[PDB]
Amino acid sequence: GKALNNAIPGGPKFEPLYPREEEEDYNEFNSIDRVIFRVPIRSEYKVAFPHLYNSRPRSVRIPWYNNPVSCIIQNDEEYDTPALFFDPSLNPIGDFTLPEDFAPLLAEEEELILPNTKDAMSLYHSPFPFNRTKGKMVRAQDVALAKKWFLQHPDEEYPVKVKVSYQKLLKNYVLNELHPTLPTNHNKTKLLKSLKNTKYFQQTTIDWVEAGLQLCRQGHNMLN
């Protein structure tokens, strides 16, 4: 959408990225007399098929297409209903004998349903953090809670004030994704780790508020 200068009605608008739209020519190819006029050719088409509805696309990435359209059902109201239950949304749709001892091997337990299997099968479809029982630690400002809110549709009822905010947050997200850094520093050890060293520093514990006040008096004394 950025590279082609055509944006989604709910997506961000950027600068052109290619300066010159100037060329406009009638021709035996171009002439409106030889072209059949039907369909609007909306910009969503230019984005959805960038090599077809858009001429001469440049720096364009091949988009993903058609996931299976998952059906998953969930019950938010009553949890008393079992884990395997036919939901109302679903359309209606003397010869040889062997000893009695054998059975289905795994059927020695009466019921397959468990108290934890409904919440478990409910966790089988979950976003990234929850579906995995093992993970690694992240800083508090690393975790982004509101990132998911501005990736979605404003829908309808909201005022324009918050919708424009959705578009702006989207723009910042796209810019942040489009130009990464990927720095590699083996050289630097923490300014604090190398800083604490030798005489002039000592390490202790303090309440957070007191640290704030100390730091305030330090700043005041230093600017003075």
Partner: peptide
């Protein structure tokens, strides 16, 4: 009895148990 139920048991037991 011999196929579907033990399969659903494989799933509910693998996830829940």
């Amino acid at each position: 009895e011999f196929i579907l139920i033990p399969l659903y048991k494989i799933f509910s037991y693998a996830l829940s148990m």
